[PDB]
């Protein structure tokens, strides 16, 4: 409970301040895939009949 919360050392600004900052903090967008936008991943394919039959 709350009694614990204050008694708990290893807490509050003081402690965090003395801890190095990770570098995931200063990173990038990561993006991951976008140069593959047009290259369809389905592996499938329509066909010239089924398209003709419909359009």
């Amino acid at each position: 409970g709350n009694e614990g919360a204050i008694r708990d050392k290893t807490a509050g600004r003081r402690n965090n301040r003395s801890k190095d900052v990770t570098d995931s903090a200063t990173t990038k967008k990561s993006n991951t895939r976008r140069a593959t936008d047009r290259h369809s991943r389905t592996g499938k394919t329509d066909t010239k009949k089924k398209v003709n039959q419909g359009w």
Partner: protein
């Protein structure tokens, strides 16, 4: 208003309420260097003490200063209201104080303690050196400590 003269009458720096006040600064604002006397408070105390607010701290008869302090630490008797006051409704004797000078340092710690001692969140939050009025603490305030 007028051109005056004076002998060696006025003294530069004068020490009232355990703190030092520079002369050659208008007495209203001169008073403010005391903890717990903002501009408003000083202005009214001075108005209440029958003092001239054209005068610097330096001038002022000992008696005049005498009054000022007396009123400052009993604002209730000398018909200063109460809504004018930094500690209405104590929380123990529930009287109405106006805590001044070295005493406001104490009383801040007093309250900060009462919270922590009763374990209430605001207290815990104080103990942690965090913002306590509920402001977002993600982006703001990163120098400090």
């Amino acid at each position: 208003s007028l051109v005056v003269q004076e002998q060696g009458s006025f003294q530069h720096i004068l020490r009232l309420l355990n703190t030092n006040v520079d002369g050659n600064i208008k007495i209203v604002y001169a008073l403010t260097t005391i903890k717990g006397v903002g501009r408003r408070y000083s202005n009214l105390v001075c108005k209440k003490a029958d003092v001239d607010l054209h005068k610097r701290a330096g001038e002022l008869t000992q008696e005049e200063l005498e009054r000022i302090v007396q009123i400052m630490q009993n604002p209730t008797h000398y018909k200063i209201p109460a809504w004018f006051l930094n500690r209405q409704n104590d929380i123990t004797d529930g009287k109405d104080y106006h805590t001044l000078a070295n005493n406001v340092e104490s009383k801040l710690r007093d309250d900060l303690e009462r919270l922590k001692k009763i374990r209430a969140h605001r207290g815990i939050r104080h103990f942690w050196g965090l913002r306590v009025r509920g402001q977002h603490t993600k982006t703001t305030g990163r120098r400090r400590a």
